[PDB]
Motif scaffolding. Structure first.
Motif, PDB file in Angstrom:
ATOM      1  N   UNK A  27       4.545   7.095   7.916  1.00  0.00           N
ATOM      2  CA  UNK A  27       3.491   7.035   6.762  1.00  0.00           C
ATOM      3  C   UNK A  27       4.140   5.564   6.444  1.00  0.00           C
ATOM      4  N   UNK A  28       3.181   4.735   6.190  1.00  0.00           N
ATOM      5  CA  UNK A  28       3.317   3.292   5.627  1.00  0.00           C
ATOM      6  C   UNK A  28       2.495   2.848   4.339  1.00  0.00           C
ATOM      7  N   UNK A  29       2.978   1.771   3.742  1.00  0.00           N
ATOM      8  CA  UNK A  29       2.057   1.429   2.640  1.00  0.00           C
ATOM      9  C   UNK A  29       1.048   0.328   3.317  1.00  0.00           C
TER      10      UNK A  29
ATOM     11  N   UNK B  73      -2.804   1.434  -0.252  1.00  0.00           N
ATOM     12  CA  UNK B  73      -3.190   2.867   0.239  1.00  0.00           C
ATOM     13  C   UNK B  73      -1.971   3.504   1.065  1.00  0.00           C
ATOM     14  N   UNK B  74      -1.800   4.506   1.464  1.00  0.00           N
ATOM     15  CA  UNK B  74      -0.856   5.025   2.436  1.00  0.00           C
ATOM     16  C   UNK B  74      -1.595   5.477   3.890  1.00  0.00           C
ATOM     17  N   UNK B  75      -0.925   4.879   4.705  1.00  0.00           N
ATOM     18  CA  UNK B  75      -1.370   4.838   6.199  1.00  0.00           C
ATOM     19  C   UNK B  75      -0.472   5.930   7.070  1.00  0.00           C
TER      20      UNK B  75
ATOM     21  N   UNK C  37      -8.549  -3.911   5.071  1.00  0.00           N
ATOM     22  CA  UNK C  37      -6.978  -3.613   5.075  1.00  0.00           C
ATOM     23  C   UNK C  37      -6.354  -5.076   5.238  1.00  0.00           C
ATOM     24  N   UNK C  38      -5.047  -5.126   4.793  1.00  0.00           N
ATOM     25  CA  UNK C  38      -4.086  -6.415   5.162  1.00  0.00           C
ATOM     26  C   UNK C  38      -2.864  -5.921   5.678  1.00  0.00           C
ATOM     27  N   UNK C  39      -2.775  -5.510   6.863  1.00  0.00           N
ATOM     28  CA  UNK C  39      -1.338  -4.873   7.276  1.00  0.00           C
ATOM     29  C   UNK C  39      -0.275  -5.891   7.007  1.00  0.00           C
ATOM     30  N   UNK C  40      -0.546  -7.114   7.065  1.00  0.00           N
ATOM     31  CA  UNK C  40       0.611  -8.166   6.775  1.00  0.00           C
ATOM     32  C   UNK C  40       1.223  -8.240   5.216  1.00  0.00           C
ATOM     33  N   UNK C  41       0.433  -7.981   4.489  1.00  0.00           N
ATOM     34  CA  UNK C  41       0.292  -8.181   2.918  1.00  0.00           C
ATOM     35  C   UNK C  41       1.609  -7.416   2.330  1.00  0.00           C
TER      36      UNK C  41
END
Ligand code: HEM
Ligand SMILES: [Zn+2]
Length: 118
Positions: free
Chosen positions: A4-6, A30-32, A113-117
């Motif tokens: 689980x990731x932010x 969100x939580x991925x 979504x912005x995975x890098x942020x």
């Protein structure tokens, strides 16, 4: 990698790069959840009582997101839906109802979504 990731994101006004009014009513990040090749997003909606429907695109169609929890005291709830390409815009639909202010609309929005942020 399973876990689980932010994940930060913005809600965008349909077919634009403008921030949607809806953005005010969701919590980022969100939580991925990553689970054997699949990606699920758990997202908190604020003013839950007002948001009567929430759908995301999947399999060429639109589906109601699963409600995985509600907090009546806080007037929030958590919806869950699948994402594919975290770098691509995700199409969504929302229906809003505020009886006291005679506000009754539905809209299309995109989620980015912005995975890098951080
Ligand atoms: C008292 C609460 C609210 C007020 C006064 C309000 C007012 C407005 C107004 C005036 C517009 C059209 C003008 C503009 O784009 O700014 C609009 C559009 C929109 N509103 Fe509402 N709204 C409210 C609540 C909500 C809620 C709870 C949602 C949840 C999704 C929402 C989502 C949207 C969406 C998706 C649009 C289309 C334009 C966009 O995406 O920004 N609004 N709202
Ligand atoms: Zn309308």
């Amino acid at each position: 990698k399973d876990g689980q990731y932010d994940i930060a994101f913005k809600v965008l006004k349909d077919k634009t790069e403008e921030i949607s009014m809806m953005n005010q009513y969701v919590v980022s990040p969100a939580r991925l959840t990553v689970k054997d090749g699949k990606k699920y997003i758990a997202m908190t909606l604020k003013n839950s009582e007002w948001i009567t429907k929430f759908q995301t695109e999947k399999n060429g169609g639109f589906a109601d997101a699963k409600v995985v929890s509600e907090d009546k005291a806080a007037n929030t709830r958590v919806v869950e839906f699948e994402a594919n390409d975290l770098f691509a815009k995700l199409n969504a639909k929302v229906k809003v109802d505020i009886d006291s202010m005679n506000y009754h609309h539905f809209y299309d929005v995109q989620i980015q979504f912005d995975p890098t942020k951080i």
